[PDB]
Design a protein around this ligand. Sequence first.
Ligand SMILES: [Mg+2]
Ligand SMILES: [Mg+2]
Ligand SMILES: [Mg+2]
Ligand SMILES: [Mg+2]
Ligand SMILES: [Mg+2]
Lengths: 185, 184
Amino acid sequence: KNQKLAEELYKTSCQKHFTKTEVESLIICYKNLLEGLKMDRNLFRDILHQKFNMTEDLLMDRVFRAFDKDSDSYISLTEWVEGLSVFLRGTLDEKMEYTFTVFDLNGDGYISREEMFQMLKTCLEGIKDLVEIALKKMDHDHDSRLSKKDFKDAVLIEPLLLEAFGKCLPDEKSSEIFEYHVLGV
Amino acid sequence: NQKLAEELYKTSCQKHFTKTEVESLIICYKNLLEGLKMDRNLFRDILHQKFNMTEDLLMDRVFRAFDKDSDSYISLTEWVEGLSVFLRGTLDEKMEYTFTVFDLNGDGYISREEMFQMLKTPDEGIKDLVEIALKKMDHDHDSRLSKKDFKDAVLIEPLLLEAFGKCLPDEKSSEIFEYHVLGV
Ligand SMILES: [Mg+2]
Ligand SMILES: [Mg+2]
Ligand SMILES: [Mg+2]
Ligand SMILES: [Mg+2]
Ligand SMILES: [Mg+2]
């Protein structure tokens, strides 16, 4: 019902950070918010806005897209749980994997200057400077763009650039409030 | 040498090396010596060729964090104690160490101006990073980081340990040193 559902999702999801009863709590939550309705871009937009204090149109579309793995324009239960696992309790690897996906605006496998300009602006002229810093202080093949390895493998040795890219993630305050209310931590 | 590694393993405040590892480190100190004492220059070379450090300011602050008596010499004791934190420190000892490195003027706060100097070493780009560091780390909202600000931030997000410059060795450098100096 809710507990049979929790069972099936704990069994099948590639979510790594939540116990099964925490999963049950996240299903109850999904249903209280929707009530049969499939969670779509609008509703997801409000959750990011009201519960997690994201303001930018472009940012919130990009977050919606990273959660919507299957690209059907709905965050299923599975995608809610999976995305919330990363989004609230993600390891560095997952966060960077997610951030790269948030930032790669055409899915070519690389973050270009133009991409990096647009996404750092909306996340946050020092934005242009930052874009040159990141490119300079990261890659082996300096070709004005950053492969997935260049992003991940570099940020490891300049932390503060992580945090410019990590406005695609909730601040500490939003996460504790959410985790408190919904999960009970 | 054996006798010396006993006296030093007894007296040193080091927490990670065995007594035989201390002996190897003593032998390594003597083999790297040029003059009679380990100075800035030799230490500069050691950081560079063994731990791949290039940036003169952080190398300076590292030398300073090792040389705890302020005499411009890494004594035997200081070498052993520093490498203990540097290679094998716990997260608490490393936060203590990296704060000391980043607090340039030793007043107990990592200021806006200090953060600026370190990240710089393109100006509106740096100015943004400084503001980003404060928004994550400055809990007491005084526009500078006390020990409490910094550690609270690192305990939450360990990547910030070295937020303003590499002042600890990477993994490869570390293991190469453990092998050829101590024996993996
Ligand atoms: Mg979907
Ligand atoms: Mg791209
Ligand atoms: Mg000394
Ligand atoms: Mg200071
Ligand atoms: Mg402060």
